[PDB]
Symmetry: C3
Subunit: 243 residues, 3 copies
């Protein structure tokens, strides 16, 4: 692939060289390898989380009694695990022969933690089997170990899917890059009060922006549209996970 | 381009190998070839289809008398054909010498049909010359043949542009991949009632999300912004196609 | 990278060959080189410019007395220059060794001008040091020279960042391509009156759509979300640039 021509940046003013941590360099390589290997499409959707939010906030007592903080992330992890089982092509990878998908029968999900040294994506194993306060505890632990460089490379392996949440900082939507060999990554941005037509008038609903990027070789437009539609449906009423 | 390292997925749990149809493999190759060849940009726009929708629904009698279903797709195909003639760089392809555009003087448009075996994009020839009930009939036929594997490879050729509609499933917008050697593809998502400022107050208008991806080597930002603006203008009042 | 198969386009109808200006061909090459080199992510945000707009319009007298037109572009250039200093990783480039960032201590910003011959991106040097009417005058001059082929290649060099504004034509958002070796580009689309929840009811605020594409090897999701959040914050109240 043609390289970018070097420029003498100091011809234009003062420059300074800072170096990249080995973590950034690793990260840089993996993103570039994914970019050139995966033809990316991003499907955008918004989910009504007004009732989910009310639930979160009411269970503040129980979560503190348990010592966990219950954010949107365990609710997101539980719903994507239910969906990764319903729509199995999202829980799979392209076999190196280019002619088979390896469908995984397990659901481990990674989530992006941005640390000073670079991006880490710890993996919670068997998300489909853990409860909201279990995933809350564990997500929190893995993030603290990630920040404190105590995350062992074992916990960075064998994910089937990645959630990347930037809702705590800002933004309306973004187009994340698939962590190949996974086949999809869910970006989540900031929730806002939005007018939503109730058939007769506009009601304020709290809306969560979702950005699903996927590997278009494995997932086609209709399948990905159906995945963010079911996810918006499960987040609007998380009780559907019970049936 | 650096390959993705193989992972032993069975170290993490049970896996299963399903194979890809030849159609998926073909599709996989073509998308990857487009991805690496076309520097992609997506221009997003929303079009007011309140009046278009009213028209569609009122002509339900005539369409049933004709045996056709009149969806948004023939209305979309007629407007893009008028525009492909107004803005001819969208109806062209980059010559293999890298230094000429081949402007096509015909308008054939493909539309994406997602079938079990994979994606098919049948082509309606000379969309600029057919009427809304003619394109309605023909689109329906080609889709049935596509699903029923009776679509002959002849009808999959020589398109100038592609419409990919996922409005029947969901989503707010997506970033489609250009089917090279074409130079653009229109993605269409779900219509929603939206408040739109009338100069004095917010009126509910039915808004259609449009996502134009284009080949930035051939089309620059201003030209693509002008294309989705004219398309939003023609869909808001389809009578402008008459003049 | 696998080439696109040639098609005999004349099998389908009349075709015509128009040639590409040398400018388009140069442009075509540079975009393709960026595309294959930079793993791109776009972060979308909206900024409340109601008060900025009021200010613009009230200073119409002063700007005309000075002979300049004061558009949104000098306001945008001043805010990104303040931010390029606050968040220095956006004002830097990846060193050819792949293992260092060259942080620039100067702020020169380019802006996209679409001319008949192709795209030109003139550079205003030391944007951080010039005033709103100075940047207004200079932006206007450079654009006229760009259109009139009088722009000397000197003024097309050593930019740290690019603003690409299509707000004067249309669109809701787009995904621009990073001009490598820069690490980010801000796309700006059309402002619309939008309902924005004031804690109790929806107020019409004039909202500007921002689309920040970045080089994900150098900038991670949280940093880019923080950059468009600070930019939305500075545009909502440009007086924060004074402190």
């Amino acid at each position: 692939i043609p390289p970018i021509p070097p420029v003498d940046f100091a011809k234009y003013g003062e420059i300074e060289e800072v170096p990249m941590t080995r973590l950034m360099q690793i990260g840089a390589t993996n993103l570039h390898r994914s970019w050139l290997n995966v033809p990316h499409v991003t499907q955008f959707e918004s989910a009504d989380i007004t009732e989910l939010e009310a639930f979160r906030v009411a269970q503040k007592a129980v979560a503190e009694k348990a010592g966990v903080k219950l954010t949107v992330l365990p609710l997101l992890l539980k719903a994507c695990a239910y969906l990764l089982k319903e729509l199995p092509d999202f829980n799979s990878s392209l076999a190196p022969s280019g002619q088979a998908l390896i469908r995984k029968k397990y659901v481990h999900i990674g989530f992006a933690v941005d640390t000073p040294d670079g991006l880490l994506v710890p993996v919670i194993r068997n998300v489909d089997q853990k409860s909201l306060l279990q995933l809350a505890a564990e997500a929190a632990e893995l993030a603290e170990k990630a920040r404190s460089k105590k995350l062992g490379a074992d916990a960075m392996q064998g994910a089937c899917f990645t959630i990347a949440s930037l809702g705590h900082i800002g933004g309306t939507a973004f187009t994340p890059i698939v962590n190949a060999p996974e086949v999809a990554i869910l970006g989540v941005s900031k929730a806002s009060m939005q007018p939503v037509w109730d058939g007769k008038a506009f009601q304020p609903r709290l809306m969560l922006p979702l950005s699903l990027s996927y590997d278009h070789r494995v997932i086609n437009g209709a399948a990905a549209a159906r995945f963010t539609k079911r996810l918006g449906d499960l987040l609007a009423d998380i009780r559907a996970i019970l049936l």
